[PDB]
Amino acid sequence: MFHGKHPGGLSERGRALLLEGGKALGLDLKPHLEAFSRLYALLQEEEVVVKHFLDSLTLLRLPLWQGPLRVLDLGTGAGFPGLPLKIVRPELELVLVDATRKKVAFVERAIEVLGLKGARALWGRAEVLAREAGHREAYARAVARAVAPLCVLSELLLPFLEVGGAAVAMKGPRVEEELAPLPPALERLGGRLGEVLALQLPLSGEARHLVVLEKTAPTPPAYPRRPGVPERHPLC
Ligand SMILES: Nc1ncnc2c1ncn2[C@@H]1O[C@H](CSCC[C@H](N)C(=O)O)[C@@H](O)[C@H]1O
């Protein structure tokens, strides 16, 4: 079984892995195979990418994605988790931000080639964008998948959220140390810790955590601090 090859897309084995992984998450990815297949072609190992599509799709284990919400994907890199999110939740109005121009260019290109409507890539720094009226507290959701610690991520994500909004920080197997000093820092930003959801990835069984930050009150004018300062002098 799964012998079929595919020059410009996911092989038969890759498609079947994505579908199986999808089902384990509770998703039917059949209507979306071609979009994911085209995304893979574009990223070009196969198994590794399908694992990234699926990790991105774990966001759907939280019921945060109903309707025409404005969503910010921060530090999206090659477009994760934002692009998989947008593929399966097409009503979301997505802005995918990255500080690296080539990444942004890749994302624009992916959006064009997948024919995604209501998604845009934006080149810029979180610290700068969050002090613009167009972006500050303009989003219902924000997401990031990043090595930058929760304390740092909170300062970068929270200022984008309208009150009542929520951010998801996608994290790996270990979150205890990053979480421990967090709640005081959230308070200063107008945030509250929501849920920390532990889960296992579909095919590998790797431990993951989704850390939900709730936006409780407006972020004071002092945050976020200047470009690179949150990273160098974390709030916690
Ligand atoms: N302050 C900031 N503003 C905008 N982008 C940032 C940023 N700090 C880091 N980044 C971007 O975040 C990305 C993290 S690499 C991770 C890529 C993608 N999120 C994934 O998980 O697959 C990098 O591409 C980097 O350019």
CATH number of the structural domain spanning residue 191: 3.40.50.150
Beta-bridge partners for 168: 143, 212
Note down the domain range covering 53.
1-236
Which residue's CA lies nearest to atom 6 of ligand 1?
A: 75
Spacing, Cα 76 to ligand 1 middle (Å): 5
CA distance linking residue 29 with residue 8, whole number of Å: 19
CA distance linking residue 200 with residue 20, whole number of Å: 14
Burial of 18 (0-12, 13-18, 19+ CB in 10 A): buried
Which residue's CA lies nearest to atom 25 of ligand 1?
A: 75
Residues with CB under 6 A from ligand 1: 75-77, 80, 97-100, 103, 125-127, 145-146, 156
Was 100 annotated as part of a binding site?
A: yes
Was 207 annotated as part of a binding site?
A: no
Compute CA distances 215 → 61, 189, 200, whole Å: 20, 9, 27
Q: Are 192 and 167 in contact (CB under 8 A)?
A: no
Structure tokens at 211: 């850390």
Resolution of the experimentally solved model in angstroms = 2.1
- List, in order, residues 6 or more apart from 38 with CB less than 8 Å away: 9, 113, 114
One DSSP character per residue, 131-164 reads TSTTTTT-EEEEEEE-SS-HHHHHHHHGGGEEEE
Spacing, Cα 49 to ligand 1 middle (Å): 18
Beta-bridge partners for 122: 97
Was 145 annotated as part of a binding site?
A: yes
CA distance linking residue 141 with residue 100, whole number of Å: 22
- In sign, the C-alpha dihedral spanning 121, 127, 128, 132 is positive
Spacing, Cα 5 to ligand 1 middle (Å): 33
Compute CA distances 226 → 65, 85, 133, whole Å: 31, 30, 16
Q: Work out the end-to-end distance of the chain between its first and last CA atoms, rounded to an integer number of angstroms.
A: 52
Q: How many residues does the structure list for the chain?
A: 236
Find tokens 């969050």 and name the residue: 130
One DSSP character per residue, the chain reads ------TTS--HHHHHHHHHHHHHHT---GGGHHHHHHHHHHH--HHHHHHHHHHHHGGGGSS---SS-EEEEET-TTTTTHHHHHHH-TTSEEEEEESSHHHHHHHHHHHHHHT-SSEEEEES-HHHHTTSTTTTT-EEEEEEE-SS-HHHHHHHHGGGEEEEEEEEEEE-S--HHHHTTHHHHHHHHTEEEEEEEEEE-TTT--EEEEEEEEE-SPPPTT-S-STTHHHHS---
Beta-bridge partners for 229: none
Which residue's CA lies nearest to atom 21 of ligand 1?
A: 145
Structure tokens at 172: 């790996």
For the chain, the domain total comes to 1
Among candidate residues 41, 47, 53, 36, the one with its CA nearest the CA of residue 2? 47
Burial of 25 (0-12, 13-18, 19+ CB in 10 A): middle
Q: Are 163 and 216 in contact (CB under 8 A)?
A: yes
The number of CA neighbours under 13 Å toward the Cβ of 33 is 18
One DSSP character per residue, 81-99 reads THHHHHHH-TTSEEEEEES
Q: Are 137 and 70 in contact (CB under 8 A)?
A: no
Compute CA distances 145 → 21, 67, 106, 125, whole Å: 19, 22, 17, 16
Neighbour tally for 66: CB within 10 Å: 9
Which residue's CA lies nearest to atom 22 of ligand 1?
A: 80
Ligand 1 atom nearest to 124, measured from its CA: 4
Was 70 annotated as part of a binding site?
A: no
Find tokens 């920080």 and name the residue: 169
- List, in order, residues 6 or more apart from 73 with CB less than 8 Å away: 79, 81, 82, 85, 94, 95, 96, 97, 142, 143, 144
35-39 long-range contacts, Cβ below 8 Å, gap at least 24?
Answer: 35/87, 35/114, 36/10, 36/84, 36/87, 37/6, 37/9, 37/10, 38/9, 38/113, 38/114, 39/79, 39/83, 39/84, 39/87, 39/110, 39/114
Structure tokens at 23: 């089902």
CA distance linking residue 171 with residue 178, whole number of Å: 10
